[PDB]
């Protein structure tokens, strides 16, 4: 009342912003209230085990670092193969607290760093949208960003992966570029180069930034809107950004001799070839001017995003992961509700008033949408831009219907604000439900309250009851955990940087017992860890993914007898019952995944030796492993650890 | 046959251009020449140390581009696209960008 | 040129993409129910062609409705035409936002 | 394989020719430093900038990226404050 | 600690209040003098 | 080994936490271990220790049993 | 007695030289990095078997051990420094010049 318009306005903007921030930080906090604060899934177990070694030992003792506890015979270098972004933002955030005598743990400032960086995303989004248009349509973006279900899936409290901290860097870089294009100041461009540098060091998806920018300038150059502002900004950002990007040891000399970063360069030369021509035309006349008138190819990984079928045909490892398939009508709406509708309206409102800044948002939305269409995992990029577009659209509708009200036809004018409020509420509800029920489930804690924590008990056993120089060999999926929890030297890791060693391990499985033993001697493997999952109903059994093992071991020069369409039955169906193919019933994988199993009564009224996951009886009821004596089998038979026997003493053929 | 126009253009650019702006062009030519020499020596011998030549060449392309940016902003004629960017706030910005560029060049070179 | 003639193309591509055309082409799913049931039982991302194109069309309507609404507000429009235009926009908005929700519930029983 | 030392020394001798050419061209244009007035702020700014460049060379031979940055964080701040003062004065004089 | 249900209810209430407040802000914005 | 840490605080309470390394001494196991025999046979694993009971001081408020790797579900 | 420096297959295989009761040999480590194994194996007819194997790890290098100030790259370093000096000179002239 008595408060002036200024004070009221700013106190409302501040209130709403603070509330949005708290909302975002307190909605990705479900996996912690239910189960204790522990990092989850296959990747966050490596980033953690690296940030920890970078905390105690100074940065200079981590830039170069040879980890001889992964790919045992080979050994992988962690110093120059990983983007050191997350580890230096977490080490710094931990060191500052220690300097302030907070003395927090390194496993507690490393779990709550995704939600914290999803509380700074809100502010950056609010500004990135307070630039394209009025503050009025900026807040409406922040709150929607706070509770966007697709983004929340990759940034819950416990997912220490460079994917909930990458979006923040992308937004900051875009805000810097938008400011540079809007104003043209050298300083702003610089402050963008720096953001790109802090983004090329944390997220492997920085090719987007050196491919949307050239696209943006090309469009701002084909329609005839290329002024000196864009020229100055682009050139400065290019130079500084590329030189900064080359610093990182992992990137090396990629920006200058690769076909992924050839866009920026081409647009640079076509920028000059344009500015100079304009200058010449200004100082000349039509008549005289008329008179005068090694590089590597597209790497398969990034090429798979263009051709959506290249993966299936050629790369037999990128198609394995579930989250590598095209998105359906049931993923877009499930993760983004009411945003999908808002996207066309936001586009239309942009296309209505083209400007230097907007022609960038439209390009980003058009590209990101297609990239999300090809692969479900890319939904990271899509949700923020869609949210920004949604913010620019609902607000416009509200603004259009906010002036018609007599206080500021009346019934029709209200009908819109009321419908919009109802849609916003429905969106908040659906977002909370999606975060709660589904996108929040601990990976290593199979639960139905009954808790199955075998994935931890077996690793702890390994870590405590094996010689300090074991060689636990398991599928590349579990490499990150075994080295962070079991603390052994797993033969294959999750980076899959050698497609012959992994093929080797594949061959060692789904083969005759002899061949397997022979392959399990060159690498000096001792223990063997297979995730049975049959007795508990686990969906992702080792047998379930055993097709990938047979299809990635028989695709190299070393082994070809393992050809597919041989483990199948005459009718080509993968049945693991008594009528299955004889070779299948004899491979090392199955032989070590159903050993002394055709006796347990898994179900009330079923044949003794039943399998819950495949709903079929076992074929090889009783057999004795020749080389693999048993060593441990967890209470629920969820993870079985065997141990390769040594060469026979008397030199007999067996064992 | 096409030299008359070139000479006329140069003459024009030697009367219609204010001082304290030609000097910028001279320094720009200097950078363009040091870059040309660098590239020529690279072609003549090839590159054993790649990061050495690459960062002893960017350290010139970046400077050249910063100089051109300063000439653009300083130019009074081009004071419609840039609003509120006084010449002093352009020179200081150029100095800051140059400092970053040189620091990174020093870090990258051997 | 013709800046709008581009927004039309973009909207058409958006309709084709949000109907999972990439999924259809990549992994051909039979557009049939095994009495035919259109929607898949429980898979979070399992698309039959009928579930896809039909769901997408709804989103496109859920966008054109708003565009029609905002366009109607323009002044100097006869009341007879304005009333019809606003009616069409409201019907498209409400109908799309309810049909999509019902479709989602049907595809995934236990929703909300 | 590395090229002969003569082919390297000749070129390093030549790389020094452009800088001399620049001076030979400037002294031709007619640039002078008459506007210099021995003001405190201006001399402090120029000295700071010179020290900053010198540091850019002392971080090559000896220093590591963790001591050079702190020194820059100090010399740059001194250079910035003096520069800003001198730039403000210059701006006022220009008007 | 805090029951999951409690947190969900708090999230719902906060989101609804934040959206109503955003609408109110739009009304105040348009009403500028 | 056992490390007993007793932190005193004049504001509220006193919190004691103890790390316990414990090892089974006699009759080191040899040969394969089989969960099937352990479950379906009472005679199997006589020397094994499934659980032990720790008497607390009758005033403990929130007792957290946690291993190095994470919170352990099983304790009564 | 034959010493073998092996990763999966012997990279190096030399003869230990007797010297004061010890079998000692000195050899440059192979360029390939990774984990390696000293593996002295002495299996002969009518004798005892000898399989001594000590695991060793060969890290690739350190960013502080590459060669610097290479003579071949003298033109690059000088040019970078020339740019740094040029800017300084330019700055002074830019700040203090009287028009004609
Ligand atoms: C499956 C697969 O693939 N996988 C993969 C993996 O993956 C993984 C990853 O990684 C991970 N990650 C992490 C981080 O970890 C994960 O990931 P994730 O999950 O995913 O996560 P993230 O990432 O984060 O996230 C993600 C997300 C996503 C991404 C998202 C996305 C989104 C988006 C959006 C995207 C986008 C897309 C796109 C497409 C874009 C687009 C856009 C748009 C818009 C559209 C549009 C379009 C367009 C085009 C546009 C257009 C526009 C326009 C405008 C138009 C245009 C216009 C125009 C005009 C144009 C123009 C034109 C023109 C210009 C033309 O996970 C995953 C999984 O798990 O990874 C891995 C890695 O690790 C990988 O692997 C890798 O690989 C590689 C390659 O490969 C190779 O191989 C192959 C095969 O074969 C082979 O191999 C095999 C096996 O191995 C065998 O067996 C066989 O036999 C054979 O042999 C081949 O083929 C190929 O070729 C290749 O070769 C490799 O390499 C690697 O390896 C490596 O590594 C490993 C481990 O690490 C190791 O072990 C090994 O050994 C190796 O190592 C190496 O390397 C490293 C690094 O790399 C290092 O460190 C080491 O040491 C080594 O190195 C060495 O070697 C090398 C060889 O290469 C060399 O090179 C080097 O050297 C270098 O470096 C160094 C350092 O480093 C240096 O030193 C040097 O330098 C030096 O020397 C030189 C000589 O010359 C000189 O020069 C210089 O100077 C020096 O320097 C020095 O020195 C001086 C004195 O002297 C001083 O001064 C200084 O200082 C110093 O420095 C250099 O050179 C050495 O030697 C592996 O393996 C896998 O694959
Ligand atoms: C992080 O880690 C912590 C620590 O591990 C963890 O917290 C634990 O969570 C579990 C939940 O699974 C809690 O378990 C509870 O334990 C209660 C205590 O049970 C004891 O007392 C029972 C009562 O017995 C009395 O009465 C009988 C006659 O009825 C009499 O004979 C007795 O002498 C006594 O007077 C007793 O029955 C029970 O016995 C168990 O064990 C024996 C083996 O010795 C077994 O044969 C029995 O069948 C029985 O299982 C035990 O001695 C218990 O009361 C409580 O029960 C509630 O829940 C169950 C379902 O689980 C219901 O069926 C029941 O009706 C009750 O509602 C529950 O079992 C445990 O106390 C926690 N510990 C701590 C320190 O916090 C966290 O969960 C972990 N975090 C996460 C996220 O998981
Ligand atoms: C999912 C994939 C679907 C593919 C769809 C491709 C569309 C994505 C490109 C988005 C670019 C939007 C920018 C844009 O459309 O600019 C508009 C309209 O003017 C033009 O832009 C004309 C050129 C349009 C294409 C320019 C880029 C082409 C592809 C980029 C490499 C500006 O037009 P104006 O110039 O403002 O209008 C003038 C028209 N007169 C009649 C007056 C002459
Ligand atoms: C927001 C922007 C900042 C984001 C920070 C993200 C962290 C990314 C750092 C990744 C490290 C890349 C590799 C690298 O930094 O190189 C390290 C030197 O190591 C370092 O110095 C790391 C310093 C990290 C902070 C740098 C601030 C960047 C400001 C640019 C002016 C090696 O340098 P040195 O080992 O010091 O060189 C020794 C020998 N010389 C003669 C060459 C000096
Ligand atoms: C990590 C945190 C750090 C803070 C922030 O990200 C989150 O990064 C800030 C930037 O420095 C922005 C300012 C730049 C100058 C700009 C001057 C204009 O006048 C106008 O755009 C406002 C202003 C001050 C920007 C406001 C938003 C800021 C503070 C951004 C936040 C989102
Ligand atoms: C020889 C094989 C090679 C692989 C492939 O078949 C032929 O060659 C691709 C085509 O280029 C198709 C795209 C065309 C552009 C069109 C843009 C729309 O926007 C988008 O909705 C559909 C999209 C991307 C088409 C999808 C199927 C593609 C990728 C086809 C693949 C299956
Ligand atoms: C045209 C100008 C620019 C080029 C330059 O000056 C003349 O000519 C370079 C020399 O090669 C100098 C090195 C010689 C070997 C000497 C070994 C010591 O050990 C070491 O401490 C110093 C070191 C490397 C000298 C440093 C300065 C260099 C690079 C000099 C540059 C500044
Ligand atoms: C922008 C800066 C960059 C270039 C520079 O200032 C301006 O101008 C260089 C000189 O050439 C100096 C050398 C002279 C010979 C002297 C011989 C000694 O013996 C030896 O120890 C040091 C050495 C080589 C000097 C080192 C500092 C240099 C490189 C100076 C730099 C700081
Ligand atoms: C994982 O296992 C390794 C292998 O033993 C442990 O590394 C040892 O750590 C101790 C620290 O108390 C050092 O004294 C030893 O020298 C290390 N071993 C070797 C071979 O160098 C490591 O500590 C274990 N990780 C844990 C316990 O968290
Ligand atoms: C089985 C796997 C699971 N996850 C994996 N990692 C990638 O697939 C991946 C990695 C990079 S990268 O930047 O790390 N590159 C190594 C420099 C880029 C793109 C990538 N995919 C995005 C779409 C197709 C290729 S492999
Ligand atoms: Mn990751």
From Swiss-Prot, chain A:
Cofactor(s) annotated in UniProt: Mg(2+); Mn(2+)
Tissues/organs with expression: Expressed at high levels in placenta, liver, muscle and pancreas, and at very low levels in brain, lung and kidney. Expressed in skin fibroblasts (at protein level).
Motif DXD motif 2 positions after renumbering to this chain: 161-163
Positions annotated with a glycan in the UniProt record: 487, 494, 498
Compartments where found: Endoplasmic reticulum; Endoplasmic reticulum membrane
GO molecular function, one term: dolichyl-diphosphooligosaccharide-protein glycotransferase activity
Sites where the protein binds dolichyl diphosphooligosaccharide: 377, 480
Transmembrane segments: 12-32, 114-132, 135-152, 164-183, 186-200, 206-222, 228-253, 262-281, 329-351, 358-374, 379-400, 410-429
Regions of this protein lying in the Cytoplasmic compartment: 1-11, 133-134, 184-185, 223-227, 282-293, 352-357
Similarity annotation: Belongs to the STT3 family.
Domain remark in the UniProt entry: Despite low primary sequence conservation between eukaryotic catalytic subunits and bacterial and archaeal single subunit OSTs (ssOST), structural comparison revealed several common motifs at spatially equivalent positions, like the DXD motif 1 on the external loop 1 and the DXD motif 2 on the external loop 2 involved in binding of the metal ion cofactor and the carboxamide group of the acceptor asparagine, the conserved Glu residue of the TIXE/SVSE motif on the external loop 5 involved in catalysis, as well as the WWDYG and the DK/MI motifs in the globular domain that define the binding pocket for the +2 Ser/Thr of the acceptor sequon.
Protein name: Dolichyl-diphosphooligosaccharide--protein glycosyltransferase subunit STT3A
Organism: Homo sapiens (Human)
Curated annotation (Swiss-Prot), chain B:
Gene Ontology biological process: apoptotic process; blastocyst development; negative regulation of apoptotic process; protein glycosylation; protein N-linked glycosylation; protein N-linked glycosylation via asparagine; regulation of protein stability
GO MF annotations in UniProt: enzyme activator activity
Pfam family, one: DAD
Main location: endoplasmic reticulum
Residues in compartment: Cytoplasmic: 1-27, 71-89
UniProt keyword terms in alphabetical order: Acetylation, Apoptosis, Endoplasmic reticulum, Membrane, Transmembrane, Transmembrane helix
Spans within the Lumenal topological domain: 49
Coiled-coil annotated residue ranges, if any: none
Segments traversing the membrane: 28-48, 50-70, 90-110
Function, in words: Subunit of the oligosaccharyl transferase (OST) complex that catalyzes the initial transfer of a defined glycan (Glc(3)Man(9)GlcNAc(2) in eukaryotes) from the lipid carrier dolichol-pyrophosphate to an asparagine residue within an Asn-X-Ser/Thr consensus motif in nascent polypeptide chains, the first step in protein N-glycosylation. N-glycosylation occurs cotranslationally and the complex associates with the Sec61 complex at the channel-forming translocon complex that mediates protein translocation across the endoplasmic reticulum (ER). All subunits are required for a maximal enzyme activity.
Family: Belongs to the DAD/OST2 family.
Name by which UniProt lists this protein: Dolichyl-diphosphooligosaccharide--protein glycosyltransferase subunit DAD1
Curated annotation (Swiss-Prot), chain F:
Posttranslational modification: Ubiquitinated by the ECS(ASB11) complex. Ubiquitinated by RNF128, leading to degradation in a proteasome/lysosome-dependent manner. Ufmylated by UFL1 in response to endoplasmic reticulum stress, promoting reticulophagy of endoplasmic reticulum sheets.
Localization: Endoplasmic reticulum membrane; Melanosome
Glycosylation site list: 71
Tissue expression remark: Expressed in all tissues tested.
Job description of the protein: Subunit of the oligosaccharyl transferase (OST) complex that catalyzes the initial transfer of a defined glycan (Glc(3)Man(9)GlcNAc(2) in eukaryotes) from the lipid carrier dolichol-pyrophosphate to an asparagine residue within an Asn-X-Ser/Thr consensus motif in nascent polypeptide chains, the first step in protein N-glycosylation. N-glycosylation occurs cotranslationally and the complex associates with the Sec61 complex at the channel-forming translocon complex that mediates protein translocation across the endoplasmic reticulum (ER). All subunits are required for a maximal enzyme activity.
Family note: Belongs to the OST1 family.
Name of the protein in question: Dolichyl-diphosphooligosaccharide--protein glycosyltransferase subunit 1
Annotated source species: Homo sapiens
Organism phylogeny: Eukaryota, Metazoa, Chordata, Craniata, Vertebrata
Record gene name: RPN1
Parent-protein start and end of this portion: 229 to 304 of 607
UniProtKB/Swiss-Prot annotation, chain G:
Subcellular location per the Swiss-Prot or TrEMBL entry: Endoplasmic reticulum membrane
Superkingdom to which the source organism belongs: Eukaryota
Segments traversing the membrane: 76-95
Biological role stated in the UniProt entry: Subunit of the oligosaccharyl transferase (OST) complex that catalyzes the initial transfer of a defined glycan (Glc(3)Man(9)GlcNAc(2) in eukaryotes) from the lipid carrier dolichol-pyrophosphate to an asparagine residue within an Asn-X-Ser/Thr consensus motif in nascent polypeptide chains, the first step in protein N-glycosylation. N-glycosylation occurs cotranslationally and the complex associates with the Sec61 complex at the channel-forming translocon complex that mediates protein translocation across the endoplasmic reticulum (ER). All subunits are required for a maximal enzyme activity.
Subunit structure: Component of the oligosaccharyltransferase (OST) complex. OST exists in two different complex forms which contain common core subunits RPN1, RPN2, OST48, OST4, DAD1 and TMEM258, either STT3A or STT3B as catalytic subunits, and form-specific accessory subunits. STT3A complex assembly occurs through the formation of 3 subcomplexes. Subcomplex 1 contains RPN1 and TMEM258, subcomplex 2 contains the STT3A-specific subunits STT3A, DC2/OSTC, and KCP2 as well as the core subunit OST4, and subcomplex 3 contains RPN2, DAD1, and OST48.
Protein family membership: Belongs to the DDOST 48 kDa subunit family.
């Amino acid at each position: 009342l008595r408060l002036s318009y200024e004070k009221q306005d700013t106190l409302l903007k501040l209130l709403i912003l603070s509330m949005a921030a708290v909302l975002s930080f307190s909605t990705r906090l479900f996996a912690v209230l239910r189960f204790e604060s522990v990092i989850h899934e296959f990747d966050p177990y490596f980033n953690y085990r690296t940030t920890r070694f970078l905390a105690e030992e100074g940065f200079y003792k981590f830039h170069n670092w040879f980890d001889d506890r992964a790919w045992y015979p080979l050994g992988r270098i962690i110093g120059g193969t990983i983007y050191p972004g997350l580890m230096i933002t977490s080490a710094a955030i931990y060191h500052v607290l220690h300097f302030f005598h907070i003395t927090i743990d390194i496993r507690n400032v490393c779990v709550f760093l995704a939600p914290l960086f999803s509380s700074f995303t809100t502010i950056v989004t609010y500004h990135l949208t307070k630039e394209l248009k009025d503050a009025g349509a900026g807040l409406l973006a922040a709150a929607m960003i706070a509770v966007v279900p697709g983004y929340i899936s990759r940034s819950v409290a416990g997912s220490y992966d460079n994917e909930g901290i990458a979006i923040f860097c992308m937004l900051l870089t875009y805000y810097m570029w938008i400011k540079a294009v809007k104003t043209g100041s050298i300083c702003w461009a610089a402050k963008c180069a720096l953001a790109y540098f802090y983004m090329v060091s944390s997220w492997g998806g920085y090719v987007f930034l050196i491919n949307l920018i050239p696209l943006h300038v090309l469009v701002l150059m084909l329609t005839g809107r290329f002024s000196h502002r864009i020229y100055v900004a682009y050139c400065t950002v290019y130079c500084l950004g590329t030189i900064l990007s080359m610093q990182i040891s992992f990137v090396g000399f990629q920006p200058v001799l690769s076909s992924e970063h050839m866009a920026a360069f081409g647009v640079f030369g076509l920028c000059q070839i344009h500015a100079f021509v304009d200058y010449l035309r200004s100082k000349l006349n039509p008549q005289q001017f008329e008179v005068l008138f090694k590089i590597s190819p597209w790497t398969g990984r990034f090429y798979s995003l263009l051709d959506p079928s290249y993966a299936k045909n050629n790369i037999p490892i990128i198609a394995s992961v579930s989250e590598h398939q095209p998105t359906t009508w049931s993923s877009y709406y499930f993760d983004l509700q009411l945003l999908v509708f808002m996207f066309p309206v936001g586009l239309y409102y942009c296309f209505s008033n083209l400007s230097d800044a907007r022609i960038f948002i439209i390009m980003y939305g058009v590209t990101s949408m297609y990239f999300s269409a090809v692969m479900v995992r890319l939904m990271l990029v899509l949700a923020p831009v869609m949210c920004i577009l949604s913010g620019i659209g609902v607000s416009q509708v509200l603004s259009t219907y906010m002036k018609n009200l007599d206080i500021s036809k009346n019934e029709v004018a209200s009908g819109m604000i009321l419908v919009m409020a109802f849609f916003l509420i429905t969106y908040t509800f659906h977002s909370t439900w999606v975060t709660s029920e589904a996108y929040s489930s601990p990976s290593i804690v199979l639960s139905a309250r009954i808790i199955f924590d075998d994935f931890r008990e077996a690793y702890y056993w390994l870590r405590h009851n094996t010689p300090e120089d074991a060689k636990v060999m398991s599928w590349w999926d579990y490499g990150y955990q075994i080295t962070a929890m079991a603390n052994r030297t797993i033969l294959v890791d999750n980076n899959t940087w050698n497609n012959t060693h992994i093929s080797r391990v594949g061959q060692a499985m789904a083969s005759t017992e002899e061949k397997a033993y022979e392959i399990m001697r060159e690498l000096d493997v001792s223990y063997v860890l297979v995730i049975f999952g049959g007795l508990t109903g686990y969906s992702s059994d080792d047998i379930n993914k055993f097709l990938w093992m047979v299809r990635i071991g028989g695709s190299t020069d070393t082994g070809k007898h393992i050809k597919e369409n041989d483990y199948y039955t005459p009718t080509g169906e993968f049945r693991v019952d008594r009528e299955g193919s004889p070779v299948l019933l004899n491979c090392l994988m199955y032989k070590m995944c159903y050993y002394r199993f055709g006796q347990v009564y898994t179900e009330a009224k079923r044949p003794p030796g039943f399998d819950r996951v495949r709903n079929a009886e076992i074929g090889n009821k009783d057999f004795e492993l020749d080389v693999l004596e048993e060593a441990y089998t967890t209470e629920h038979w969820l993870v079985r650890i065997y141990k390769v026997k040594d060469l026979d003493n008397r030199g007999l053929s067996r064992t | 046959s096409v030299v008359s126009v070139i000479s006329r253009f140069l003459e024009e650019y030697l009367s219609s251009t204010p001082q304290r702006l030609k000097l910028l062009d001279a320094y720009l030519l200097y950078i363009l020449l040091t870059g040309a020499l660098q590239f020529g020596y690279c072609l003549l011998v090839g590159t054993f140390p790649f990061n050495s030549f690459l960062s002893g060449f960017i350290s010139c392309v970046g400077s050249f581009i910063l100089a051109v940016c300063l000439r653009i902003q300083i130019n009074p004629q081009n004071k419609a696209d840039f609003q509120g960017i006084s010449p002093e706030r352009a020179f200081a910005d150029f100095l800051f960008a140059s400092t970053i560029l040189h620091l990174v060049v020093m870090n990258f070179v051997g | 040129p013709s800046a709008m003639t581009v927004y039309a193309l973009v909207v058409v591509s958006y309709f084709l993409i949000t109907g999972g055309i990439i999924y259809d082409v990549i992994v051909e799913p039979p557009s049939v129910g095994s009495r035919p049931v259109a929607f898949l039982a429980y898979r979070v991302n399992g698309q039959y062609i009928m579930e896809g194109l039909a769901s997408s069309f709804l989103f496109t309507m859920g966008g054109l409705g708003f565009i029609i609404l905002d366009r109607s507000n323009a002044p100097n429009i006869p009341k007879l035409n304005r009333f019809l235009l606003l009616f069409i926009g409201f019907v498209c908005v409400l109908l799309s936002f309810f049909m999509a929700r019902v479709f989602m519930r049907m595809k995934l029983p236990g929703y909300l | 394989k590395r090229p002969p030392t003569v082919v390297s020394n000749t070129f390093t001798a030549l790389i020094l020719s452009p800088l001399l050419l620049l001076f030979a061209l400037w002294i031709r244009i007619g640039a002078n430093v008459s506007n210099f007035t021995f003001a405190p702020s201006t001399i402090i700014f120029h000295l700071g900038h010179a020290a900053m460049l010198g540091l850019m060379y002392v971080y090559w031979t000896q220093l590591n990226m963790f001591q050079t940055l702190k020194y820059l964080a100090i010399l740059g701040s001194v250079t910035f404050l003096a520069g800003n003062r001198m730039l403000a004065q210059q701006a006022v004089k220009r008007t | 600690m805090i029951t999951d249900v409690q947190l969900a209810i708090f999230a719902n209430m906060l989101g609804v209040s934040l959206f109503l407040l955003v609408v109110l802000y739009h009304y105040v914005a348009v009403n500028n003098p | 080994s056992m490390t007993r840490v007793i932190e005193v605080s004049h504001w509220g309470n006193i919190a004691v936490e103890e790390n316990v390394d414990l090892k089974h001494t006699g009759a080191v196991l040899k040969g394969p271990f089989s969960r099937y025999d352990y479950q379906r046979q009472p005679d199997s694993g006589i020397s094994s220790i499934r659980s032990f009971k720790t008497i607390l001081p009758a005033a403990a408020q929130d007792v957290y049993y946690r291993d190095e790797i994470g919170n352990v579900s099983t304790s009564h | 007695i034959q010493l073998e420096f092996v990763r999966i297959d012997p990279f190096v295989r030399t003869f230990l030289k007797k010297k004061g009761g010890k079998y000692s040999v000195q050899f440059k480590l192979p360029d390939v990095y990774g984990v390696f194994q000293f593996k002295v194996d002495y299996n002969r007819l009518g004798y005892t078997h000898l399989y001594s194997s000590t695991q060793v790890s060969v890290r690739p290098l350190q960013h502080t051990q590459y060669e610097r100030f290479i003579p071949s790259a003298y033109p690059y370093y000088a040019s970078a420094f020339s740019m740094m000096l040029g800017l300084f000179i330019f700055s002074i002239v830019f700040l203090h010049m009287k028009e004609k």
